[PDB]
Amino acid sequence: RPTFYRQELNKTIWEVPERYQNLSPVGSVCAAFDTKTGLRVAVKKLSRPFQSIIHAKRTYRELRLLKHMKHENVIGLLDVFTPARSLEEFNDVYLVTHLMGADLNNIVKCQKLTDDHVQFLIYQILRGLKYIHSADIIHRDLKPSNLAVNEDCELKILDFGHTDDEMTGYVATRWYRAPEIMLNWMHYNQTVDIWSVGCIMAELLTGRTLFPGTDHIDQLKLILRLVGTPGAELLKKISSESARNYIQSLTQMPKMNFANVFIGANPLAVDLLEKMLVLDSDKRITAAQALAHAYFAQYHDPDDEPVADPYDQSFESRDLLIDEWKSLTYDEVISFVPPP
Numbered sequence: 223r224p225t226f227y228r229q230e231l232n233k234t235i236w237e238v239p240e241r242y243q244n245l246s247p248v249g250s251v252c253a254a255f256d257t258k259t260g261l262r263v264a265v266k267k268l269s270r271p272f273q274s275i276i277h278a279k280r281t282y283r284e285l286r287l288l289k290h291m292k293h294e295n296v297i298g299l300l301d302v303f304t305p306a307r308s309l310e311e312f313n314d315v316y317l318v319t320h321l322m323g324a325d326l327n328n329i330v331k332c333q334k335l336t337d338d339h340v341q342f343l344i345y346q347i348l349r350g351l352k353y354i355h356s357a358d359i360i361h362r363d364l365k366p367s368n369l370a371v372n373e374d375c376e377l378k379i380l381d382f383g384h385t386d387d388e389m390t391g392y393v394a395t396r397w398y399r400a401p402e403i404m405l406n407w408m409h410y411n412q413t414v415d416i417w418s419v420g421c422i423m424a425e426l427l428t429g430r431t432l433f434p435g436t437d438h439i440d441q442l443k444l445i446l447r448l449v450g451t452p453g454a455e456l457l458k459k460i461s462s463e464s465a466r467n468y469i470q471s472l473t474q475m476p477k478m479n480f481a482n483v484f485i486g487a488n489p490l491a492v493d494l495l496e497k498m499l500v501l502d503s504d505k506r507i508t509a510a511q512a513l514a515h516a517y518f519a520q521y522h523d524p525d526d527e528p529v530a531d532p533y534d535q536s537f538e539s540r541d542l543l544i545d546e547w548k549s550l551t552y553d554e555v556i557s558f559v560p561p562p
């Protein structure tokens with residue numbers, strides 16, 4: 223058990239192992255320097271981790287997820303600790319990850335990137351996503367602000383999956399969401415993430431948001447105008463009779479010519495975009511198939527695009543008491559083993 227020291231950071235008391243020095247607030251979260259590894263890190267102190275069933279299960283969920291992800295393009299766990307000496311005294315949870323420079327959103331917003339630049343960034347997103355999906359995990363909330371990238375243009379996927387108010391109106395919180403998930407059309411798959419990737423890729427190519435809807439319905443119109451209104455085949459997969467019914471009230475529209483939308487773009491980028499932005503999620507290209515697309519010929523290496531070990535999330539189906547979620551969380555904290 224290391225030695226911990228106390229420090230108040232904005233009306234917040236932090237108690238962390240001596241190895242972590244020079245803590246400074248960044249959002250709760252502090253950047254620090256881990257003298258044991260020589261790594262600049264981000265330290266998050268969870269706010270009231272076990273105040274309710276929903277919160278206790280959320281804490282367990284986040285810890286299980288982070289402990290599982292071990293990939294260069296996905297945020298992983300460097301350390302997790304509690305100053306608590308036993309389960310009875312257990313109340314706080316601190317999570318340590320690599321400190322990232324800035325998110326994609328804060329970096330290239332309103333800016334058109336070069337094609338080589340787009341290839342590299344999207345390739346890394348797809349490499350991370352192939353790893354995540356292989357574990358049967360769905361990000362569900364990919365957006366430029368959940369993608370961090372350093373100077374060398376190295377990228378990590380962060381913040382896996384929301385307040386209905388924050389999804390209302392002209393907001394980036396909904397612009398990258400697959401239509402089937404935005405309007406709850408059905409039980410969704412992992413290709414919801416691919417739709418997100420297409421929205422991101424287009425924005426990097428044009429410097430412009432692909433479907434900046436002013437609300438849910440305006441966004442659906444922007445989408446259908448580009449990809450076309452649904453055909454009979456997809457209509458049947460929409461479990462919601464009301465949703466299905468609303469869809470049918472719309473004037474039919476054919477899919478637009480993508481080369482005429484992304485004018486001047488690499489023809490290979492245009493082709494991949496058409497394969498990612500397919501309305502019927504059963505037909506979208508998967509992350510693994512995309513990595514093999516000729517657009518990434520310059521980066522693709524089948525021997526350097528690993529998959530994840532199986533991820534047991536049967537716990538999502540369980541209804542336990544706070545003390546039970548708390549005890550499971552504690553076990554995950556003490557059984558933690560740092561990466562090499």
Ligand SMILES: CCN(CC)COc1ccc(Nc2ncc3c(n2)N(C)C(=O)N(c2c(Cl)cccc2Cl)C3)cc1
Pocket residue numbers: 247248249251264265266288297317318319320321322323324325370380381
């Ligand atoms: C205008 C306000 N400024 C202050 C100057 C804030 O700007 C920042 C603040 C931090 C960073 N880098 C940064 N790298 C890694 C993480 C992270 N922030 N954050 C915030 C987390 O929460 N991380 C995290 C997750 Cl996603 C899961 C579990 C544990 C952690 Cl620590 C990682 C970049 C810009």
